[PDB]
Amino acid sequence: AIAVDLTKLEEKLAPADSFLDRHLGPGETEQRQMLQTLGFDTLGDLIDQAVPPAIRFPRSLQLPASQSEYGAIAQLKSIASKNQVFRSYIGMGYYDTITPPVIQRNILENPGWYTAYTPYQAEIAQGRLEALLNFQTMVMDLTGLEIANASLLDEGTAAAEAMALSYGVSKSKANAFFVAQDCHPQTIEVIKTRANPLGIEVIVGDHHTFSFSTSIFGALLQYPATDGAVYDYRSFIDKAHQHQALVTLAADPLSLTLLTPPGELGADIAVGSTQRFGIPLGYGGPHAAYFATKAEYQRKMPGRIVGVSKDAHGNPALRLALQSNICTAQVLLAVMASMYGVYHGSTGLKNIALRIHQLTVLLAIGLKRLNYSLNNDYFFDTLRVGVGEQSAPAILKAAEGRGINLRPLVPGEVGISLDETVTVQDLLDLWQVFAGKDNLPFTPEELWSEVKTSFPADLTRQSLYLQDAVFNQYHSETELLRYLHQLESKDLALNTSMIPLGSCTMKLNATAEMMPVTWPEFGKIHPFAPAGQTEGYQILFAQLEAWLGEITGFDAISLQPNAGSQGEYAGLQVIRQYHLSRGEEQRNICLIPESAHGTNPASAVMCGMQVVPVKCDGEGNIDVEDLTSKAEKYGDRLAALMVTYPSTHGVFEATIGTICDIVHRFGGEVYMDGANMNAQVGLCRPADFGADVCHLNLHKTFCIPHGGGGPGMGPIGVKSHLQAFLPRTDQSIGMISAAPYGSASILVISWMYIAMMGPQGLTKATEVAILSANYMAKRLENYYPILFRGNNELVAHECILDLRPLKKQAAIEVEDVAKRLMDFGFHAPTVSWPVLGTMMVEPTESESLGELDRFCDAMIAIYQEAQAITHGEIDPADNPLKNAPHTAQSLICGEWNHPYSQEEAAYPAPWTKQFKFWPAVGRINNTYGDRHLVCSCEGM
Amino acid sequence: AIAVDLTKLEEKLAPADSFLDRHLGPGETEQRQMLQTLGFDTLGDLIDQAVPPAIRFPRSLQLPASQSEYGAIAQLKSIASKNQVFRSYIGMGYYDTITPPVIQRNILENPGWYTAYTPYQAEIAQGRLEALLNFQTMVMDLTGLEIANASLLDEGTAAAEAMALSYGVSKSKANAFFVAQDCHPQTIEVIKTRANPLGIEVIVGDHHTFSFSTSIFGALLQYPATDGAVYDYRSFIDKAHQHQALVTLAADPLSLTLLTPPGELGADIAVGSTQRFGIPLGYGGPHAAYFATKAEYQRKMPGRIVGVSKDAHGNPALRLALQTREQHIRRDKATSNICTAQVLLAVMASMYGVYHGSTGLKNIALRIHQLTVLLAIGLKRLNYSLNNDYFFDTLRVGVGEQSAPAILKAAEGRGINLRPLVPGEVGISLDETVTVQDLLDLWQVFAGKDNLPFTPEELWSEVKTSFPADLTRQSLYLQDAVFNQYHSETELLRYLHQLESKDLALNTSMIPLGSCTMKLNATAEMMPVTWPEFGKIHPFAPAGQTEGYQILFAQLEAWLGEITGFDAISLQPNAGSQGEYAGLQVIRQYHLSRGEEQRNICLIPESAHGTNPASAVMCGMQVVPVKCDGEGNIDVEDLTSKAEKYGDRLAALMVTYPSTHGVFEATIGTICDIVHRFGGEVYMDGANMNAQVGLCRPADFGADVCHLNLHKTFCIPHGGGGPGMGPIGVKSHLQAFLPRTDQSIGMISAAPYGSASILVISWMYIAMMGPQGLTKATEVAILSANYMAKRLENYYPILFRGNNELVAHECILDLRPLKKQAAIEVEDVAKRLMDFGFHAPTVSWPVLGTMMVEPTESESLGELDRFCDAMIAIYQEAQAITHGEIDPADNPLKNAPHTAQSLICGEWNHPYSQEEAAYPAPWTKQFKFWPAVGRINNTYGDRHLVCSCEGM
């Protein structure tokens, strides 16, 4: 009433700063210029030709009117204020930790570190590649195992990956996987959820009493246990090996500064979280999980691995080596965890752990004086305290009164996990809470004389860790600042130039969106804090669920899955559970078009489905006749079709509705991979044209930053008939991520984007993304054939450039073009996917016309360079394309013996003389790196 | 008791992360190595031999025990939470504003922008130089005037600089300066405080009724006025010109998007604050003030000015221009005492202009003006009297004596502050943050009820937002490409990144600038600056809303008092220059208070910072230099002679300790005794306090007053040339005269606590270091300086040493032999260091032909050694010239710095290789910092002064 009147009045005022105009690259003038090159007068008219009318969303999105950056921040701040920041000593896999301010400011809040994506182009990613090498080295050193990857999604899924690895190398008919009952309970549920569709039996029980009567292929043990107890696992491991099973330890990596590590205990695999290496609690994430194992299983390892190779000049250089459904991981958070190791060093890390342990021993001695029973013989940071059923509720409440959360274990027992933030003053609060009064029957300092903090020799670590120079040389703040800056300077990120990676949506990660991630009311909340303290998050989730529901047209949203791969997997699990609920167990066929992202069939197989490929036609589109024939053939067994819309070829197929009808006719569900949603928002809705479930990549379409290769979030939307089966936050599939809302803290980014854009702005973004892709295609089409065009000769949000003629004409490979683009100051687009020998270019709506033109001009110049080779005008082996990228040192030092000038090499376009980005290394030898796998700092 | 018990227990625990170990560069092993090189068994021995045992502080500093970064942040957050963030519509020269998040994150919270200092080495400072050029251009465009500088400290002091300029160019014998009574009241006080020691008569009155009967040399008018009124000042300006006076307008630069600008009105000078170009309120600062005037007054402009020149390759390049105006060359004859200014905030303000452009800026002002007109119409419906005929953002509302307190109280109940004007009148200033919902609150507060006799939208059809033709601006502004090209966030992100990449700051390598103390600006120290509880408070908010700041100030006053030994501390002065000036003002007031008005002689040793004699002249004192002896020390005999001669007239001695020569003189106590014997006060320049903290205290060895540079010794970042804070400590007998926060000197800074928000940085430093840590920092600073001197002494003579052949926290390297032997100039060495990846140390000050090197305690041994190795390599390059082994005119020293383009493009015709040019040391092959331009032609730039984007 009064509010409606204010909105009228506000609309009369001079126009205010609109976030849409900061998010978009091309303004109205630039848009009109682009449209004219395309032969359209208006964007609306172009979009009417791009999007098939039958699937066009016929109205505006029902979303809140856009807010300014200032207003949206203020609104979210009021929501955030409803959360309460307690001292949580809940433990269970998440422990408060101190992020060194220098790392918070210069990595987590630095777009130079969070805006690039996976280091596909290694020569311009040596900085984050080195940080990841440090991460691998830290994990190898602490676990005592031979190889480690460049991070997994969270502790529980890493453990599930360990189960899968163990299953693969098993040669027995053993179908059971033993999980110790004192693993973290969310880990157990994630494992059970992954085991279900594969028919794997999960046996959960006390490791002490496991009989080894039932054949197992693997076992998972928690170290220290979830209730805190530190056990000697050697005997169990020995017995498991006698029964041909691999043993995985889920091991707290901070505890491994003190405790005998998994490698020395005989464990085959180690997993865990690196969250307490200075990564915010985040109400669940994002945190990098680790995965370490024996070198003999290196070809079986999940995820990405950084390896040391050499460049064209013989110098050391890093690359992803040996290239599960996992794609996007947790790179940014692995960088933070490794920098925590670099800044603290081995001595510093051990002192942090020793202090935590000393405080926990002191805590225990005082609780004993208060006549409580202490169950753990040995512990790192976590006590199991027997208080009796009568006292447990009052203690937990008194604790809450002081803003402290403890862990309820079983009736009459309370768990307490201390951490890096804990002070002697916190200890006093704990004693007084347990005493029920403030005057204690002891003095704090009096207890120190009793403090015995050693472990038995069988559990006392002697081996060293983090001995490489990198962990010793950068302990002043100034030193670390400079190290970070040097690594950052090697990497080409979005603060330098457009990174037009097809299938990745490298759009603006706006400062206003990123800001709230590091507000303590979002970042400093334990994922299992009582609901009464997380009402701000509850509001955030409810809003995001409603908004993503409206965008997709689905009736329910699960925010849990913490990657695109996880969303696909969750979606297929929900479909599987649906068929089971109808008494249709035999439905296990998953139809997948050959063009699909590789995550799709990997996810299907993980879900116990049998993949049946569906041909794509001569235009690159889904072959409807073939789909119909396969659907008919597998009618009784059809579980699902997984479809990407628009296709991985960047095309709006007009047949999508018909395709869904066919699948439904034969009893299947339709799953839509939502990676290409940047061509859809406001223009079509998956639920409307026949999808039953989809996932969204929030790190593509909805602005979560690419993080150098992570983090992401992959929420799913489902129709009502599937809602009952959604992951838990009688019928649920269980848990897909370790935390109920996955990496909850980064969800604020997509909330901010939607709040600041509003329904018209979100739709305009989609439209401009399509305009810019089509503009680039039109500019380049006479130089590089555009491989797949939709109806009306338009593409969607990306286009595929055919580089195969250059190979025929000039013996030039796509890799040569990709490296030569570095000399022009550009990261290459997506290379050789989905079609070998091509590039897929996706500019997004956030890049200016000037930037688009520079990229096209670079490609045209490279076209002319290839023509020169074709026409014999320059040596076919010694030319800028074959020798790219050109380092400054290669141009300045030694003799210059090439048939082109140093200026032609380094400044091939005018903009490079205004600002030059220097490739840090020459072209990296890929085959050499895979042949001689070196994955730690020892090799560099 | 219980805390005592806990402290005891905590000491038993494994060592936690100590901030001291992050702040220091050299650890214990590195320190032992450096001591071995120096021939000392312990650091204690070195310090006992460096510091005269007589002035030595005989106990530990009484300061709180060190806290971790985590604990100190928590403690300050608790303090900050006591402040209340209101919607302040108080105005008076400070208005809430929206800092674009992209600028907050990538400039204000980016050490790449805030760690370097004044762009003395222009070739490695083109980024901030360009941002300053944009600032000047924005100011010129908006004011309609011909030249503008690269910032002043605040609005009131800028107006005082305008008074000084007007006095300096006056054709008459006029001694009076007219100040309109509707200038901001703090501006009036700053002006009066500056006029007092110069004997200038300040007339404060209604500009409408000024008779011009008393001759004036200048007039200051406020536009719009402090109460909001917009006046047509043309007639006044014409009359002032008829009477041979200059007119300065203190003009709100946002309002100039709509209002006819000073230049077009005929004004000679414009000053103001650029705070509302996206700079946090900051409880007073820091904000860059602007100063614009006519080209014909170039040589009299205060402060720094960026000018477009060209480099060795004929390419456009920027540099500081007309430097003989400034204190470091000209000293007592400088145009002002200003040194450190507000560069970081000028960068932010110009980026606000770049991001919003002319259209965006105008829309911000239009919307503010529309909201204010709407507010006005509503208040009239409620039967209130509205006094301003025309206004931009500020209303003067007649409410009556009886209602005014209740309205103010009701506003406070909704978390709103208004401005008390006079009894029965209330001021309201709207700003960029204001929404129609805020309007509704204001109307309901004035209505005394929630249901209004009108609806908001209904009022719109009555809104006239235009001004009379004679006040309506027609001229364009910000038409240069730079203000149009970077409006997407991604574009601005990239522009900022490209500029930042051109500049060598502390995230690259050590910048060992003597007299500057380029130590760690720790992230934890910087973090609280941008907490809203510090950044979003209006400086004239009611005391009940600022208890967190009260606590911060009390603690800082106590701690700096303990460090200096002084009885009272003033946190007001907002630069070292202001601290000196405030100190001299208090000394002057003291002599007057004793009935000793004739004391106006200020003794100043020849080595002193140019700010010293400049400050003295501004304080109405006559400078008498005191000679330095053969060994560079103050000549006690000469001091005594002059003290005797000017006995009856001796006001002060200004002394820097340790000296600007980097030496601890053992005579400092005797020197103070002599000054006191002859009736003078002793002022100590505390810019070298990084050699003193915990080791000696100025008050203990004879100083009556000192200033500290928090941006040198206490970690406020150098900001590319600002901001700073220059608090003063005084003995009890001077306390009565301190600036207002019957006897006060008045106001030195426009805001009572100057740039209050940045004081949290120094609070954090002290809290995290503790007494032993602060003292260790001083000792390591001295160790590292002596280490570098020892390493370099056989190559470059150490010009001055103290007792036991030691230096203090810095040393002077004599490069004059290189000039004699090889015709190598100090600037040659400075540019060649760029090719080694280093910013030069301080060049040619205090001694021409030398370099003064100050590493600070924050730089590692490895880094100290690389710098020494660079200087040694350069020495060998000079020796090759000397021995005739290379063309004396064509060699790396003469041609430095070497851009990548100069090496890669075109034919290479030099008797040395490109590798020798770009990679003269092995670390450059690990990480190469590229100079963005070749050597800049200085004389060409001063000959053809171009100070806006049109030239570049």
Curated annotation (Swiss-Prot), chain A:
Class of this enzyme: oxidoreductase
EC numbers for this chain: 1.4.4.2
GO biological process per UniProt: glycine decarboxylation via glycine cleavage system
SUPFAM superfamilies listed in its UniProt record: PLP-dependent transferases
Residues recorded as bearing N6-(pyridoxal phosphate)lysine in the entry: 700
Protein origin, superkingdom: Bacteria
Subunit structure: The glycine cleavage system is composed of four proteins: P, T, L and H.
Protein name: Glycine dehydrogenase (decarboxylating)
Organism: Synechocystis sp. (strain ATCC 27184 / PCC 6803 / Kazusa)
